[PDB]
């Protein structure tokens, strides 16, 4: 009881559709954002440009994270026979199932169906496994994805390198923070 295979199958397909669409939209919005950084740098407002590129870095990391989750949903669909057949969790699926349960509370603001995918996977493999996933006590959640959805501020050198590349591309004079470039 609780678990319904078709709820999981339908919602996995929906999650892929929604992620596939959000990646495109967010990629386009990053173009518009980078133009705005060049405008701030041209206006000599470098100290603000630094804080505006933190938004760009976070959206870029998020788009990369959405690509990883798209892949794990597509993997659970490809090997959906195993999910439905066994009662134990296979090794091949452990990364995917644990990561999707871990990610859902972070992403479910944007990708509402991802909550239902997580809830069904917890109904299948039990609530206790679901709790061990959400904290990564299960030690199986994908490390790169957890990095990409971290709440920490970007490294100062990443911010500076972003400004250097954007400034170069839009032919705007920029001089990077000497202290940060030295610390690197």
């Amino acid at each position: 009881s609780g678990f319904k295979a078709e709820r999981l199958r339908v919602n996995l397909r929906l999650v892929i559709n929604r992620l596939k669409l959000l990646e495109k939209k967010k990629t386009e919005l990053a173009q518009k954002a980078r133009k705005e950084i060049a405008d701030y740098l041209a206006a000599g407002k470098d100290e603000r440009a630094r804080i505006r590129v933190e938004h760009i870095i976070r959206e870029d990391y998020l788009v990369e994270a959405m690509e990883i989750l798209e892949l794990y949903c597509d993997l659970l669909l490809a090997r959906f026979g195993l999910i439905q057949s066994m009662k134990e969790l296979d090794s091949g699926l452990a990364e995917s199932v644990s990561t999707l349960i871990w990610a859902a509370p972070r992403l479910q603001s944007e990708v509402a169906e991802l909550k239902i995918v997580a809830d069904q996977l917890c109904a299948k493999y039990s609530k206790e496994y679901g709790k061990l996933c959400r904290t990564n006590q299960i030690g199986t959640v994908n490390d790169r994805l957890m990095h990409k959805l971290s709440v920490e501020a970007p490294p100062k050198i990443l911010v500076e390198r972003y400004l250097i590349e954007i400034a170069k591309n839009y032919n705007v004079p920029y001089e990077p923070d000497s202290v940060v470039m030295a610390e690197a």
Binding site: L21, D60, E64, P155
Partner: protein, 84 residues
């Protein structure tokens, strides 16, 4: 009166909801079109479409080969993310 009944926080909410509900309608159009596409797969074989495009491109003098699966700032900013 109207700035009370629809204050900026309420407008902010309404605009967020508006945007998020058109994201959902995009997801729905996509899967209606994917269904119709699979529904009439035998009426449009891929190779026949590819050959008609190549024939029309040959007539137009366009060099682009139509059977094949036919920005650098984005690439460089990606390389930066990998390097850190």
């Amino acid at each position: 009166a109207t700035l009370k009944t629809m204050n900026l926080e309420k407008i902010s909410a309404l605009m967020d909801k508006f945007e998020h509900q058109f994201e959902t309608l995009d997801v729905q159009t996509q899967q209606m079109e994917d269904t119709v596409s699979s529904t009439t797969t035998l009426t449009t074989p891929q190779n026949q479409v590819d050959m008609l495009l190549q024939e029309m491109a040959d007539e137009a003098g366009l060099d682009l080969n139509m059977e094949l699966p036919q920005d650098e700032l984005s690439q460089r900013l990606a390389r930066l993310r990998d390097q850190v």
